Design a binder for this molecule. Structure first.
Ligand SMILES: Cc1cc2nc3c(=O)[nH]c(=O)nc-3n(C[C@H](O)[C@H](O)[C@H](O)COP(=O)(O)O)c2cc1C
Ligand SMILES: Cc1cc2nc3c(=O)[nH]c(=O)nc-3n(C[C@H](O)[C@H](O)[C@H](O)COP(=O)(O)O)c2cc1C
Ligand SMILES: O=C(O)c1cc(=O)[nH]c(=O)[nH]1
Ligand SMILES: O=C(O)c1cc(=O)[nH]c(=O)[nH]1
Ligand SMILES: [Mg+2]
Ligand SMILES: [Mg+2]
Lengths: 311, 311
């Protein structure tokens, strides 16, 4: 019932882990491969291995989560070597996704060049929430910087490429970004990354709950579904059909998944809920979505994909 | 215990309604005057009376609310006439707040000029989430446009003035805005307005819940407290002491109020929760905050104001 076609590949279902959750090590990845997830993505990597920020840097919240991991990862070469070896085993239907988040534009270009030159036949995801010039907003909030980077990337990168974007909150911003993205042969857009720089407080202790950035961190979970759905829908109605969408943000139940698909998302990623529940979540949410579809008499995602009704 | 000093005026407590909620008519305003609210603010007005968007345009949600009211209001003259007459009765400790959200820069300047010329001795709040040039983001997301407007405003406006701002999600944005705002003799900054363009879906009906903007609307309530607290705190540590802060966003319990005050807010505004509960909320939340203070042995907000601890 959930069979999905994305980036010209076939997947058993649309579910995937969100980058950063349960995908740090080869062991994490193997557990994802073993789960019911239709596909999985690696932790955003940088050129060098990164320890990340001081703990505590992640906290479960009643309505979601807050984090400031600091891009901890085992380095580009570690992930590239892993995906290259699994690619050869052909023991998995559907390509693996490879996320990169260079500490700089030069680092992103360098990693993209290595992926291009390698035999990697999978899908690449460029995290545009990656660092940028000192007195500059995250890359994706700097429209000029974003367009400049993408133009250089597409002068040489011919393999499947998608971009992970932060949430937008103004319709003109969606228009500007859509216009920038539509000029490129992008495989997809993934909305959204966590809601940036939120703050959570322990009232009793009268203090923040994470050590880095004075307690400020990305927000995920139920807090952000309204924003995540909006971004998925806003891009669905603005992007050229060539560019598909991956919906990410506040997905925990089959109903949440149903809502993202209704908005136009083709693949779905689970972050916070997966972090709390573990790989077993995929089997649960898959069954939940199928039950919803059964009650409505739907046999394929195509029966409702992108059919969100306006009043 | 909650006595507060703000904009050089004295208030029985920091609580107020958030603009747009329970402040449309003179009758609404009188009910706010009659409640325990330490102060109140009028609905953002425009030069002409506005009917607002088609219904349904506001919906209560389990975790907050979504709206696209479309600035319905009775017109500038109606509100100005009201506050001028109440000002004379001296039957209220602390000035009334007057919100304006011109459909254009010319409209904001025109209203500010009328307030300046009038005998209004209260406080004015400029809603920088007001409309802007066609292909331009809301005013407050257009740093250049915002600075230009404020410079013109301060070439003539000498009365107390505060600005209502939308939420920001990047630290560099807070730096840029703080730098722009610190150059003016502003009375205060009010963070935050609703999280813009969120989307809520009724999965059974497979449709949005508000009629305008294809269902997209500002999000308020529990969904946004993490973002609201972050904005209050981020500005508290960047604004010159001359500019105080009004905390708005996800305030429903004494604990929520405690958190905003801990961040640096001096006055507090309640939107969503007030819309659901009615003016009686002020008596409840006041008691809730006082109980929290009593348990901690605090006798004045000064005992913890802005004392949020980092790890
Ligand atoms: C602990 C943690 C680490 C994350 N790491 C990444 C990362 O390396 N790259 C990326 O693009 N997104 C990262 N994200 C963001 C997620 O991919 C996802 O966009 C976010 O958590 C919103 O989804 P959710 O509501 O299901 O959590 C991370 C989120 C969390 C909570
Ligand atoms: C129905 C409604 C109308 C609103 N109207 C205004 C308005 O005219 N001007 C303004 O500055 N903010 C307006 N707001 C935003 C609030 O003042 C407040 O910033 C927002 O609801 C976030 O607070 P909350 O979490 O307590 O709801 C409105 C919010 C709602 C729900
Ligand atoms: O590694 C992290 O801290 C991180 C990266 C990213 O893109 N998003 C997030 O929420 N955390
Ligand atoms: O009147 C409205 O629609 C409105 C104005 C504003 O500033 N904020 C909001 O959430 N709604
Ligand atoms: Mg599997
Ligand atoms: Mg009163």
């Amino acid at each position: 019932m959930l069979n999905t076609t994305f980036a010209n590949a076939k997947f058993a279902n649309p579910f995937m882990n969100a980058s950063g959750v349960h995908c740090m090590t080869i062991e994490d990845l193997e557990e994802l491969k073993a789960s019911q997830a239709g596909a999985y993505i690696t932790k955003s990597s940088t050129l060098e291995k990164r320890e990340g920020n001081p703990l505590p840097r992640y906290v479960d919240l009643e309505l979601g989560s807050i984090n400031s991991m600091g891009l901890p990862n085992l380095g580009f070469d570690y992930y590239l070597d892993y995906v290259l070896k699994n690619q050869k085993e052909n023991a998995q239907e559907g390509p693996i996704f490879f996320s990169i988040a260079g500490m700089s534009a030069a680092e992103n270009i360098a990693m993209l060049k290595k992926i291009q030159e390698s035999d990697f036949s999978g899908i690449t995801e460029l995290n545009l929430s990656c660092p940028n010039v000192p007195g500059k907003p995250q890359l994706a909030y700097d429209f000029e910087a974003t367009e400049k980077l993408l133009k250089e990337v597409f002068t040489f990168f011919t393999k499947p490429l998608g971009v992970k974007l932060p949430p937008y909150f103004d319709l003109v911003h969606f228009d500007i970004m859509a216009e920038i993205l539509n000029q490129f042969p992008l495989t997809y857009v993934n909305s959204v990354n966590s809601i940036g720089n939120g703050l959570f407080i322990d009232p009793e202790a009268e203090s923040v709950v994470i050590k880095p950035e004075d307690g400020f961190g990305g927000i995920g979970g139920a807090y952000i579904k309204p924003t995540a759905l909006a971004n998925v829908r806003a891009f669905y109605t603005r992007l050229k059909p060539e560019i598909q969408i991956i919906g990410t943000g506040g997905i925990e139940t089959g109903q949440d998944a149903f809502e993202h698909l209704l908005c136009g998302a083709t693949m779905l990623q689970i972050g916070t809920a997966l972090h709390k529940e573990g790989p077993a979540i995929f089997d649960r949410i898959i069954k939940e979505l199928e039950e919803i579809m059964n009650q409505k008499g739907y046999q394929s995602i195509a029966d409702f994909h992108g059919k969100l009704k306006s009043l």
